[PDB]
Design a protein around this nucleic acid. Structure first.
Length: 115
RNA sequence: AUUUGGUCAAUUUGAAUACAGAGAUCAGCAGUUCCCCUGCAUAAGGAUGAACCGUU
């Protein structure tokens, strides 16, 4: 959680400051991509010695308060349709839901350009 | 393109039993040190009071 928070701080610091300029500088973008991945992998490593095929993004990007890590993504992350299903136990029965495409929203859209 | 990072311990053994592993929480009081006040003692050191004359 702490690590995630730190990452968020770093990312926010980068963006809130260089707002408009990050979109141009490709190297920085690449680093961000990779950095995020690295961060994710640390957590993965902690969880298990074997690295997973794929975690759900849920565990990372879901907020601190819901019980996630609350990473603030800087990448084209793909929330797989499989990882959006859910169920509900009721008196009537067990109503389900399953699943365009869903993408973890990136910090980019949410900081207003300096101009 | 495959794979290692994945062994419960403990006990009974000459695999079975176990099955994660064995005081908590709330509250007093005293002591320790330093400080302040208070009463007493001990030394020291003052300050002062009390009629009226004394002793070979």
């Amino acid at each position: 959680t702490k690590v995630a928070a730190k990452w968020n701080t770093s990312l926010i610091s980068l963006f809130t400051y260089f707002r408009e300029a990050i979109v141009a500088t490709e190297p920085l973008l690449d680093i961000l991509v990779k950095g995020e991945t690295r961060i994710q992998n640390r957590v993965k490593l902690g969880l298990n010695s074997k690295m997973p095929t794929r975690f759900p993004p849920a565990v990372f990007y879901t907020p601190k308060e819901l019980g996630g890590l609350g990473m603030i993504s800087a990448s084209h992350i793909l929330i797989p349709a499989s990882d959006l299903s859910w169920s509900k136990q009721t008196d009537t029965g067990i109503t389900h839901f399953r699943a365009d495409e869903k993408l973890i929203p990136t910090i980019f859209r949410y900081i207003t350009t300096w101009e």
